Write a protein that binds this ligand. Structure first.
Ligand SMILES: O=C(CC1CCCCC1)Nc1cccnc1
Ligand SMILES: O=C(CC1CCCCC1)Nc1cccnc1
Lengths: 304, 304
């Protein structure tokens, strides 16, 4: 019993973290097989960061200008190329710690573990959601860039996120491992407002199922609702509209708990309309939206 | 910027996790040098678990009855002994992944990372506090026992916690790595009520400093207070009394932010007396007490 914002075990990712230095700027790289993936803003200087001409900047850089250090051993860089907003540095050595891995572009609402890194060294790990507005609410300083998000299916590490920039609002933006930004963000030093952030309704419901499973049930009411009723309430409170897809994905939690999805929606509806009246659910005084139905099933059954 | 309930990178601990099986019961072991540390209730059967005579039970067990498996290779067990509530299984092979480590008994209020494990396999990692009543609010199922808590100072893993039992209230109890329970708990199948849990006041203050640093400051007021005034308010609300020690430890956050500790106490006082009025601090609708002043400094500066 008990329920925690649990991150994936970070060991398989630790073994892939390197330091990347170009001119003066240092940040993190991801060493998989004989390629190191890092943010392309590694090649920038403070005078460039306004509106960097990454193509013109990269012309001026040679394999020898990319200092790649794994612990206390340097990697020889035999190739460099720019794919969208990441650099691929071909090195002469395969990372002997390369886990089974894929590159996956996650969907907003989907969760992942971040291993925050500085100078290619891990500092810690936490679980995150891709916000509906394609931002993450991270813990990232100068030198945390190139830290990656991931999921792990048994032995396969799915890399979904590379950290690039912090918005003036203090929220985080980043790319997939093909260096495509999640959201409209560009790697520049300009004000870039994040759209309206909605609450990930299906994740709140999944978390309400986790609560019931772990014995927090005071919020179960004698009401039901309809997708269309519930969604009128969702709109008001900037929740994502609930679809039959979302309901289908909650089926395992519905089946286990025997609480129909639309009944739980009616619990959610009442919590939105009346607040929590100074009570808590799984040690939280607000509605947690960063556990997927998958996350709840995994943790509540103990998948490894 | 941003602030997260961050766990230590779990890789150094993953490499120490094994499976321990005695009779039918399976749970987790910790393989360091040529010793495997596991909960002694591994030797119990469901008929024993009421009031187990661990000494008499252990008589009946031989080195060959302790099946110790690291991934898909068995360890030969050349010795077994009981220290308090853990078993030390001497194996013929040193764990080649043994990190630098110590065994440290933590103080209540101190935090640590848990790597929850099943069948010697990691499932995930989260940050925890030893509650003032020597319980932890974990995420642990059947087979999670022998999962360990830890801190990491650069390269040294300090093991502080081994998970043993869940109380009927669904809160967790466990030992240091010398198998001494934190708190009054015994490894039996009896109702064992946990004392009153207080809020770890110094950690809330440290978290209030983290909030101010990350730009959440709406709770800063024009008031101050005194240790003795503040502590009258602490009592009412079951906060731990604040001491000069606690104030001394907040000095780095006070100095950085230039907000005297007793001023922040006066912020805390008002939050206790008036609640949060439906606002949030670092994405929380209640007062977080599971970040130490050390934790806040580490994360806000980015120690690795
Ligand atoms: O965002 C920047 C600088 C950006 C990076 C992209 C190019 C313009 C400059 N640094 C940073 C700081 C804290 C957390 N994350 C990232
Ligand atoms: O607590 C028990 C059984 C206790 C263990 C000690 C001896 C009496 C039996 N199992 C469990 C379940 C979930 C999380 N943690 C532990």
């Amino acid at each position: 019993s008990g329920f925690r914002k649990m991150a994936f075990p970070s060991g398989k990712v630790e073994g892939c973290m390197v330091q990347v230095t170009c001119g003066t700027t240092t940040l993190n790289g991801l060493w998989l097989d004989d390629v190191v993936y890092c943010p392309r803003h590694v090649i920038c200087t403070s005078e460039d960061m306004l509106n960097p001409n990454y193509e013109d900047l990269l012309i001026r850089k040679s394999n020898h200008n990319f200092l790649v250090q794994a612990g206390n051993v340097q990697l020889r860089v035999i190739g460099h190329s720019m794919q969208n907003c990441v650099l691929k540095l071909k090195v002469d050595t395969a990372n002997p710690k390369t886990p089974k891995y894929k590159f996956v572009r996650i969907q907003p609402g989907q969760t992942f573990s971040v291993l925050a890194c500085y100078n290619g060294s891990p500092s810690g790990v936490y679980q995150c959601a891709m916000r509906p507005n394609f931002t993450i609410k991270g813990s990232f300083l100068n030198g945390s860039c190139g830290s990656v998000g991931f999921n792990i299916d048994y032995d396969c590490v799915s890399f979904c996120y590379m950290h690039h920039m912090e918005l003036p609002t203090g929220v985080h933006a980043g790319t997939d491992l093909e260096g495509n930004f999640y959201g409209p963000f560009v790697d520049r030093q300009t004000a870039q407002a994040a759209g309206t952030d909605t609450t990930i309704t299906v994740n709140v419901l999944a978390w309400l199922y986790a609560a019931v499973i772990n014995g927090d049930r005071w919020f179960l009411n004698r009401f039901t609702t309809t997708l269309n009723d519930f969604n009128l309430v969702a709109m008001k409170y900037n929740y994502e509209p609930l679809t039959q897809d979302h309901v289908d994905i909650l089926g395992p939690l519905s089946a286990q708990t025997g609480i129909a999805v639309l009944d739980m929606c009616a619990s959610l509806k009442e919590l939105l309309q009346n607040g929590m009246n100074g009570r808590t659910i799984l040690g939280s005084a607000l509605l947690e939206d960063e556990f997927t139905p998958f996350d709840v099933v995994r943790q509540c059954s103990g998948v490894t």
